Design a binder for this molecule. Structure first.
Ligand SMILES: CC(C)N1CCO[C@@H](C(=O)N[C@@](C)(C(=O)Nc2cncc3ccccc23)c2ccc(Cl)c(Cl)c2)C1
Lengths: 296, 301
């Protein structure tokens, strides 16, 4: 029993964090094999990059300075070729995630990991993270068996306090640029499939007060969900929620009628899993993983 | 900007997780130097649990009865001793991944990270607090026994908790790394219920200061209060008494924000009376009590 916001064990990623300094700027880098990946703003970017030489980039892995032997740019990420391959390089992949998907963030300052938290790619492509100056280059990941899938690299904080970044191939999530200009996060929406998964986690944990005898059509639910700035629920989401529906005996459209009532009437002084708001940062897979105990 | 429930990087603890099997029971152990620490109930059967005589059960065990597995390598047990409710299994190999560590016993209200493990394999990390009733609101399934709670301070891991059991309400009970249980709990399947839980007042105040540091001032008011009047109100909402130690501990945050502790106490009194009126504080509709004054300072600066 118990439902916590749980991050993946960060160990395989900690062994990859390095500090990258160029000029007056110090930020974090991800050392995988003989390459260090970091935000290109550490330095027209190709014009500024041409002016740089290998020895301008100081890379520090703990108390050992790594020597840069090459540099290239891929979209908004700078790839610093180093002479030493990271012996702690885990089995990894670079994956691009979709909005609504969750991942763990290993927040780092000066190439030193300081915290790990779980978060979701918001539908507006920002992440509601926890970062301070020096956190740039901190990464987002998921762990599947023994494979670390790197999905995010922190690049900036938007004026509202939310964060924007790229996948490990340097492509930004969202309509952002790594430049000094007026940029704002779009209006955010609630990740509907995630709230439903969290309602199933609540049922698995013995919280049934919000359940009702009613069901709804997918279309009537979407008409209501659109009113409360909830993401449309697709047939794929309904299919993805299948296992939780089978385990609890509550059909997805049955749980949708519960969600509809919660949106129209509120919680009435009641909580669900210790929360007075509907939580949307647990995917259906996170709920199954935490209410089954999959290990890494 | 931003305020998240943040756990410590779990790497230094992952390299210490081992699987301990005794008969039909399999749970987690903490391999530090040449010793594996685990709950002593690993020697019990489900029947033995009502009234186990641990010394009687342990005297009947030999080293080879304990199977210890570190990844895909079986460790050889060369000795065993019991210290309170923890079993210490001496092994023939020192863990090369042993970090700089200490065993610390924490007080209620203190927070720590939990590396939840099953079969000696870490599956997740979360942050939580020692509740005033000495339980932890964790996320544990069967096989998580021996999962540890820790803090990391200057490359040093301070182990403060080892998971032992789940109480009937869904909350968890366990010991420090010297085998002493937190609270009045025993590693016996007897009628044990967690006492009525209260809100960690000093932590809610710290979280209100984190909100002010992050630009959220809507809940502040022109009032101040005496420490005694605040405690009389706080008791009525099942909030822990705020001591002069708590007021002193909140000093740095009071100096940084310019809001005196008793001034913030008056805001808390008003929040308790009014509720949030559809508003949130740091993305939360409830008053958060699992961030200590030390966590707020570490995360916001
Ligand atoms: C009902 C009874 C016939 N049996 C069925 C088989 O499992 C028995 C059981 O609960 N075992 C543990 C290991 C336990 O509670 N550990 C766990 C730790 N964390 C989360 C848990 C979530 C679900 C289940 C167990 C959890 C136990 C039991 C009694 C004591 Cl006194 C102690 Cl110290 C530890 C209860």
């Amino acid at each position: 029993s118990g439902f916590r916001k749980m991050a993946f064990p960060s160990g395989k990623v900690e062994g990859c964090m390095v500090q990258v300094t160029c000029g007056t700027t110090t930020l974090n880098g991800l050392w995988l094999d003989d390459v260090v990946y970091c935000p290109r703003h550490v330095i027209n970017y190709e014009d500024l990059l041409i002016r740089k030489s290998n020895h301008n980039f100081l890379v520090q892995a703990g108390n050992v300075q790594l020597r840069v032997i090459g540099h290239s740019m891929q979209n908004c990420v700078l790839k610093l070729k180093v002479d030493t391959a990271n012996p702690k390089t885990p089995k990894y992949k670079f994956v691009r995630i979709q909005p609504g998907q969750t991942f763990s963030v290993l927040a780092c300052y000066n190439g030193s990991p300081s915290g790990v938290y779980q978060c979701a790619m918001r539908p507006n492509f920002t992440i509601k993270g926890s970062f301070l100056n020096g956190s740039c280059g901190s990464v987002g990941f998921n762990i599947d068996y023994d494979c670390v899938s790197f999905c995010y690299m922190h690049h900036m904080e938007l004026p509202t306090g939310v964060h924007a970044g790229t996948d490990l191939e340097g492509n930004f999530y969202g309509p952002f640029v790594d430049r000094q200009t007026a940029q704002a996060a779009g209006t955010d929406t609630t990740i509907t499939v995630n709230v439903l998964a969290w309602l199933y986690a609540a049922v698995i944990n013995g919280d049934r007060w919000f359940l009702n005898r009613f069901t709804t059509t997918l279309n009537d639910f979407n008409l209501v969900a659109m009113k409360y700035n909830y993401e449309p629920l697709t047939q794929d989401h309904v299919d993805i929620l299948g296992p939780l529906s089978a385990q609890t005996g509550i059909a997805v459209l049955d749980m949708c009628a519960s969600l509809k009532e919660l949106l129209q009437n509120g919680m009435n002084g009641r909580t669900i899993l210790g929360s007075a708001l509907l939580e949307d940062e647990f995917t259906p897979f996170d709920v199954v993983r935490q209410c089954s105990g999959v290990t890494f």
